[PDB]
Amino acid sequence: ASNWRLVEVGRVVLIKKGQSAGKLAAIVEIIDQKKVLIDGPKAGVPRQAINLGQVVLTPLTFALPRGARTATVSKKWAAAAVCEKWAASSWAKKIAQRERRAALTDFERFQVMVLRKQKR
C-alpha cells in the first residue's frame, strides 16, 4: 500500500503502472495486513495486495494522502464489489429465526414472478 509497505484505514497507499491496468492506486479494506484491496479508482480500477514487486507510492506520503483517498474516492468506491461485497457480509445474518424471514420472504416472490414467467 505504498507499495507494498504503508499505513492506516483511511490513508496511505500510492501506486500505478506496469502490468495491464495500473496508475497511483491506494489502500481500501484489509485483512489487517492479510488481503487489502489496493485501488485508486484508479479513475476506474481494481486493486488487491498482490504485490510489492518494485515501484511504489507515487508522489507523497500521509496527510497529502489522507487529504485525497476519500477527498474523491471512497464515496466513489461504491460500485459492485463495493456493493456486491457488503452483501456477502450480512450473509452472516440472524439466519435462525431470520431464516424463516428469509424463507417465507422469498417463498412469496416465487409465485409473484413464477406466475409472470407464463402469462406473457
Partner: protein, 191 residues
C-alpha cells in the same frame, strides 16, 4: 534485466487494415488478405493510435523482448505481402548436361518438375506454392521467377525446388550445379 515496458511500432500503410485481434491477426489490402496465428504467448499487440499499431511485451526479458521484434517483423513483412510485391526469383545453373524447368501436373498441379540434373534421369517433381504464381522464363535465361504474397510461402517453394535439385556423390564444389536462387524481391513496385 527484465524490462517492464519494451514495445515496437508496426506501421500500417494507406490501404491495408490489420484484423489483428483474438489471438490471430489478418491483413487485407492491395493484393488481398493473409492471416497469421501468432501465439508467441505474449505481445498484446495494440493499439489504434491511427498510423500505427504498436506491439510490446510488458515486464519480461529474453525471448519475450526477442520475440517482441520477431513479431513486429513477422506481421510487418506480412503488411508488405499485400502492400508491395512477393516476390522472389530462382536462377538455375546448368552443368554439361542441362535441366528441364516445366510446370505439370496431376489432380492439382504439382510441378515444377525438373528433369536430368547433372545429367540425371528420374522424375524430379515438387509441389507448387499454393499461393504463388510460378512463372518460368521471361527475356530471359533459365530462371523460374515464381513469386506471390506469402513471403513465407514464396521462399519455401523457391527453395523447395532448389533442394528437390540434389547432388549426391561428387562432394559438390565442381560437379556443382543446381537450380539456385536470385533476387529478393519486393516486386513489383520500387520507383
Amino acid at each position: 534485466m527484465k524490462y517492464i515496458q519494451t514495445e515496437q511500432q508496426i506501421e500500417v500503410p494507406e490501404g491495408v487494415t490489420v484484423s489483428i485481434k483474438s489471438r490471430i491477426v489478418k491483413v487485407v489490402g492491395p493484393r488481398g488478405t493473409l492471416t497469421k496465428n501468432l501465439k508467441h504467448i505474449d505481445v498484446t499487440f495494440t493499439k489504434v493510435n491511427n498510423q500505427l499499431i504498436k506491439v510490446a511485451v510488458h515486464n519480461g526479458g529474453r525471448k519475450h523482448v526477442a520475440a517482441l521484434r520477431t513479431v513486429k517483423s513477422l506481421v510487418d513483412n506480412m503488411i508488405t505481402g499485400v502492400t508491395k510485391g512477393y516476390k522472389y526469383k530462382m536462377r538455375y545453373v546448368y552443368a554439361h548436361f542441362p535441366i528441364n524447368v516445366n510446370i505439370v501436373e496431376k489432380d492439382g498441379a504439382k510441378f515444377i518438375e525438373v528433369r536430368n540434373f547433372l545429367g540425371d534421369k528420374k522424375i524430379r517433381n515438387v509441389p507448387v506454392r499454393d499461393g504463388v504464381t510460378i512463372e518460368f522464363s521471361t527475356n530471359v535465361k533459365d530462371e523460374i521467377v515464381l513469386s506471390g504474397n506469402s513471403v513465407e510461402d514464396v521462399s519455401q517453394n523457391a527453395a523447395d525446388l532448389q533442394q528437390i535439385c540434389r547432388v549426391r556423390n561428387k562432394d559438390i564444389r565442381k560437379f556443382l550445379d543446381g537450380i539456385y536462387v536470385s533476387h529478393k524481391g519486393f516486386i513489383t513496385e520500387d520507383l
